[PDB]
């Protein structure tokens, strides 16, 4: 077999679901960008220390039952340091420096790309790319339940400083805090 499948680029290439957002009958949900959200794609990045990667995002909107309704939604990106919107009618949604993507539910999922946002040369896992904001357009509530899922790919993977993997299960989100053996056991030494 060739070396193309085991390469660093193809190991982070496959897409995954990094978020789940549900809007009951609120109107707006602010979700912070994090790659540590789920167990998968997390253990993989702790193998390395320094990582430099572009971010590709996918916005998929639907209802709880799956049917699509012709309703217009707004997808806004908030750069690091910018104030977060406190409501739907607030000033943060009319801000010119916050890019927006206007898509409908019948509109197939839009794809946006986020360049490298860190002031340093690479990320340090041992990382805030900003936050999102999403609301339904109009000054009135929308009588439809919106449940959306965000897909995230990784483009132009760069890796440095390979680190040993973590055998113990994760405790908290921001810290790698009953020790467990990393391997199974057997009754004797000479047994197979």
């Amino acid at each position: 077999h060739s070396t193309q499948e085991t390469a660093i680029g193809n190991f982070f290439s496959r897409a995954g679901l990094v978020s789940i957002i549900t809007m009951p009958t609120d109107g707006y949900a602010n979700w912070d960008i994090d790659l540590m959200g789920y167990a998968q794609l997390r253990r993989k990045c702790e193998l390395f220390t320094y990582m430099r990667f572009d971010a590709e995002f996918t916005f998929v909107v639907a209802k709880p039952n799956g049917e699509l309704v012709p309703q217009l939604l707004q997808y806004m990106y908030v750069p690091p340091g910018a104030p977060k919107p406190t409501s739907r009618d607030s000033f943060a949604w009319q801000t010119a420096t916050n890019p927006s993507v206007f898509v409908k539910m019948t509109d197939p999922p839009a794809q946006v790309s986020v360049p490298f946002m860190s002031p340093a040369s690479a990320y340090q896992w041992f990382n805030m790319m900003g936050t999102f904001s999403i609301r339904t357009v109009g000054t009135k509530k929308s009588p439809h339940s919106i449940t959306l899922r965000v897909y995230m790919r990784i483009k132009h993977v760069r890796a440095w400083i390979p680190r040993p993997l973590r055998n113990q299960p994760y405790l908290f989100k921001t810290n790698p805090n009953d020790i467990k053996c990393t391997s199974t056991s057997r009754d004797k030494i000479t047994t197979l």
């Epitope: 009958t25 109107g27 009135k140 509530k141 009588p143």
Partner: antibody
Amino acid sequence: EVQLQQSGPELVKPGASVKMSCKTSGYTFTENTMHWVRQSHGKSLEWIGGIYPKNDDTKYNQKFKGKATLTVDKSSSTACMELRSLTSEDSAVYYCARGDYENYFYAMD
Amino acid sequence: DIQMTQSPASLSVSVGETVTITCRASENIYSNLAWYQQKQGKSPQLLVYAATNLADGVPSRFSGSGSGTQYSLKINSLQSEDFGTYYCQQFWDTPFTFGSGTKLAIK
């Protein structure tokens, strides 16, 4: 039988604060939510705010953002409300009502 | 902002007649409306919610109706225990703005 008992009225100097608390009984507190309603003179009703003690998360009226402050105690199954910077027109009647099941809709019985 | 008022200011209906009361809303909730019974010196209680279903302790004499931005409450017939005022409720968006209130009398 669901019963919510409030405290007694108090005399507050304008500019000071006030402590309003009413205990809950007859049901399970933490699964449901809490709300507050102010009755202004002569006859009017207004929704102060609500608290759902699973997080805790809350929402208030636009005018009460800088006045009303809510907190809950799940040990004694009571709900508390704080009001500051009282003025001459702030004299009114308050109510203690229990909301829906993880919902603020479904009008309170 | 969401805003609504009732009409008319006050009514007078004796025992055994039909009461027609309405509260109009500016926007359209499509779903939820509630009516409260508040006497002198006592707290309100729930009567009819969602413009259709009625709460416990309420007899069949109270029936709601209406759709869209036009709602109504039909009382047939009136009894001597129904004295008090009525309000309206809107779940459409926060904050909730209640009704202005309407007083009842006996002709």
